[PDB]
Amino acid sequence: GWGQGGTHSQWNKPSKPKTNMKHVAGAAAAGAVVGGLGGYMLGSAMSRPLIHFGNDYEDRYYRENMYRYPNQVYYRPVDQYNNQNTFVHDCVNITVKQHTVTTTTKGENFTETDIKMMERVVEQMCITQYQRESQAYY
Amino acid sequence: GWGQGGTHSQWNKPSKPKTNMKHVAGAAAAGAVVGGLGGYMLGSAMSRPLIHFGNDYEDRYYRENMYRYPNQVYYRPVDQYNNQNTFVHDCVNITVKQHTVTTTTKGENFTETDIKMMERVVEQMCITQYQRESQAYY
Amino acid sequence: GWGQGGTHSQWNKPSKPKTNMKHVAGAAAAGAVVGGLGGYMLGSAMSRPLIHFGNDYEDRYYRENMYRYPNQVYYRPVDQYNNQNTFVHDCVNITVKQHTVTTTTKGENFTETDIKMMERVVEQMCITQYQRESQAYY
Amino acid sequence: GWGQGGTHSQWNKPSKPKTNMKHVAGAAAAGAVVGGLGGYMLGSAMSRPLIHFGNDYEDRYYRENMYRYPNQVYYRPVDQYNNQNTFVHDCVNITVKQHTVTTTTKGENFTETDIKMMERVVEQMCITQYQRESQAYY
Amino acid sequence: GWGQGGTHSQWNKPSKPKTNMKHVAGAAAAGAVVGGLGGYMLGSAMSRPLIHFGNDYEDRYYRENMYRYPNQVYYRPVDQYNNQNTFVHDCVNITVKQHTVTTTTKGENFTETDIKMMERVVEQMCITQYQRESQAYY
Known part of the structure; x- marks a missing residue:
């Protein structure tokens, strides 16, 4: 008549992550997990891969x-060009x-x-602007 | 008459992630998980891959x-060009x-x-602007 | 009639991470985890990989x-070009x-x-500006 | 009738990390963990890799x-070019x-x-500016 | 009828880390952990790698x-070029x-x-400015 307490566990538990960035390349940010037994795994071979959040009981004889x-x-790859x-x-x-x-x-x-006038030709380009109750004057 | 407590577990539990970014290439962001036993796995071979959130009971003899x-x-790939x-x-x-x-x-x-006038030719281009109760003047 | 207390454990528990950055390349930031038994693993081979947040009981004979x-x-790769x-x-x-x-x-x-006038040709370019109740004058 | 207390343990528990930076390349910042039994592991081979936050009981005979x-x-890789x-x-x-x-x-x-006038040609470029109740005048 | 007290342990517990920096390359900063049994491990081979925050009980005969x-x-790699x-x-x-x-x-x-006028050609470039209730005049 034993007892195991319930598990309330988080591999990543970020609370209110307020983040400002530009580029997220091949990385993790803003409280994000790149793969649980996975992610970016081009060539992989896993035997009996098991994920179960529930309780586990085993009675083996x-x-x-x-x-x-x-x-x-x-795992014997030959000439793998992927x-x-x-x-x-x-x-x-x-x-x-x-x-x-x-x-x-x-x-x-x-x-x-040879006259080549070039005036006001490009005023804005690639303007990645996020506005919230704000003003921008160009 | 034993007992195992219920599991309330999260691989990723981000609360209120407020994030501003531009590019997310090959990465994870804003509280996102790239694959559970998966993701970007071009060449893979998994024997008996099991995912079960429920409770597990095994009585093996x-x-x-x-x-x-x-x-x-x-896993024996030959000349794999994928x-x-x-x-x-x-x-x-x-x-x-x-x-x-x-x-x-x-x-x-x-x-x-040879006269080539070029005035006000492109005023805006690639303007990725997100507006919320905001003003933009060009 | 024994008892094991419940586990409330976090591999990463950042509270209110307020962060300002520009580039996150091949890294981790803003309370993010790059992979649990995973991530960026191009060539991998794992036998019996198991993740279970729930309680584990084993009675082996x-x-x-x-x-x-x-x-x-x-793990015997030959000429792996991935x-x-x-x-x-x-x-x-x-x-x-x-x-x-x-x-x-x-x-x-x-x-x-040979006259090449070049006036006000590009006013803004690649302006990654995040605005919140703010003003920008160009 | 023994008893083990519950484990409330965090591999990384940063509270209110307020951080300002520019580049996070191949690193960890803002309370982020680069991999638990993982991360950036291009060539890996792990036998029986197990992660379980729950309590573990083993009765082996x-x-x-x-x-x-x-x-x-x-682990015998040959000519691995990844x-x-x-x-x-x-x-x-x-x-x-x-x-x-x-x-x-x-x-x-x-x-x-040979006259090449060049006036006000680029006013701003690559301006990664984060604004919060602020003003910028150009 | 013995008893082991619960473990509340943190591998990294930074409270209110207020940090200003520019570049985090191949390092750790702002209360971040680079890998638990992991991180940046290009070539690795680990047999029976186990991480369990919960209590462990073993009765082996x-x-x-x-x-x-x-x-x-x-671990016998040959000609590994990764x-x-x-x-x-x-x-x-x-x-x-x-x-x-x-x-x-x-x-x-x-x-x-040969006249090449160059006036006000680039006013700002690569201005990584973070503003909070602040003013910048150019």
């Missing part, structure tokens, strides 16, 4: 049992340019005029 | 049982350009005029 | 049992340029004019 | 049991340039004019 | 048991330049004018 390589993980990649390209290769190429041969008594 | 390689994971990739291209290869090519040969007594 | 290599991890990478490119290769190429051969009595 | 290499980790990398490129290769190339051969009695 | 290499870690690196590039290769190349051959009675 093993007699003369021949266990030959139980839960064996024969790609599981995350690519994020934001505002890349942005160009605001004015280019002029001049190739004049034996130009006599000639006038060359 | 094994006698003279021959278990030959139980739950065996024969691709599971996430590609995000936002506002990439954006060009605002004025280009002029001049190739004049023995130009005599000639006038060349 | 093993007699004359032949256990030959139980829970064996035969890629699980996170790429974040934000505001990369941004160019605001004015380029002029002049190639004049035996130019006699000629006038060359 | 092993008699004449032949355990040949139990929980054996045969890449699990986090790449963050923010505001890289940003160029604001004015370039002129002049190549004149036997230019006689000619006038060359 | 082993008689005539042949344990041949139990929990053996055969990369798990964190790369953070912020505001790198930023160039604000005015370059002129002059190559004149036997230029007779010619006027060369």
Whole structure:
């Protein structure tokens, strides 16, 4: 007539995490867990992987049992070329340019005029602004 | 007549996570879990994978049982070329350009005029703005 | 008639984490856990991996049992070429340029004019601004 | 009729962590734990990895049991070329340039004019500003 | 009828950590723990790794048991070339330049004018400013 107390356990219990950041790449933030027996596991081999939050009871009576390589993980990869990649390209290769190429041969008594006005061409770009009861003036 | 207390357990229990960020690539954020016995697992082999939140009871009586390689994971990949990739291209290869090519040969007594006015051409671009009771003036 | 007290345990219990940062790459921040028996594990092999928050009871009676290599991890990878990478490119290769190429051969009595006005061309770019009851004037 | 007191234990219990930083690369900050039996483990092999927050009871009676290499980790990788990398490129290769190339051969009695006005071209860039009841004037 | 008192133990218990910093690379800060039996462990092999916050009870009666290499870690890596690196590039290769190349051959009675005005071209860049009831004037 024994007794085990109930388990109220948290692998991650962050209370009121107020966080301001920009980039979360390959990481964990704002009270987040990257995988329980998992996550980013490109090549894996797990024998008898068990997750049970409930109570566990085992009453085992093993007699003369021949266990030959139980839960064996024969991890023998050959020439494994696997790609599981995350690519994020934001505002890349942005160009605001004015280019002029001049190739004049034996130009006599000639006038060359090259005017490239560039005014108020881009006022805003990639403005990741979060506003809450706020004001922004540009 | 024993007793096991009930389990109230959370792998991730974030309370009121207030977070501001821009990019979450290949990561975990805002109280999120990347996989329980899973996630981003391109090549995997799991024998008897079990998840049960409920209570577990086992009363095993094994006698003279021959278990030959139980739950065996024969992980032998050969020439595995697999691709599971996430590609995000936002506002990439954006060009605002004025280009002029001049190739004049023995130009005599000639006038060349090249005017490229560029005014108020792009006022806003890629403006990821979140507004809540706020004001923005451009 | 014994008794084990209930377990209220947290692997990470941060209370009110107020944090300001910019980049979280391959790390942990704001009270976040990178993996419980997991995370970023590209090549892994785990035999009998078990996670159970509940109480555990075991009553084992093993007699004359032949256990030959139980829970064996035969980790023998050959020529494993795997890629699980996170790429974040934000505001990369941004160019605001004015380029002029002049190639004049035996130019006699000629006038060359190259004017490239560049005014108010980019006012803002990559402005990751978080506003809460605040004001910004540009 | 014995008794074990309940365990209320935290691997990391930071209370009210108020932190200001810029970059968290391959590290831990703001009360965050990088992995419990995990984290950033590219090549791993763990036999019988067990995590249980609940109480553990074991009543083992092993008699004449032949355990040949139990929980054996045969970690023999050959030519393992694996890449699990986090790449963050923010505001890289940003160029604001004015370039002129002049190549004149036997230019006689000619006038060359090269004007490149550059005014108010970029006012702000990569401004990671967090505002709370604050004001910014540019 | 014995008794063991409950354990209320913390591997890291920082109370109200108020911290201001810039870079946390490959380190620990703001009351953060880098791994419990983990962290940044590129190549690892652990036999029977166990973490249990709950109470542990063991009543073992082993008689005539042949344990041949139990929990053996055969750590024999050959030609292991693995990369798990964190790369953070912020505001790198930023160039604000005015370059002129002059190559004149036997230029007779010619006027060369090269004007490159550069005014108010970049007002702010990489301004990682955290504001709380504050004011900034530029």
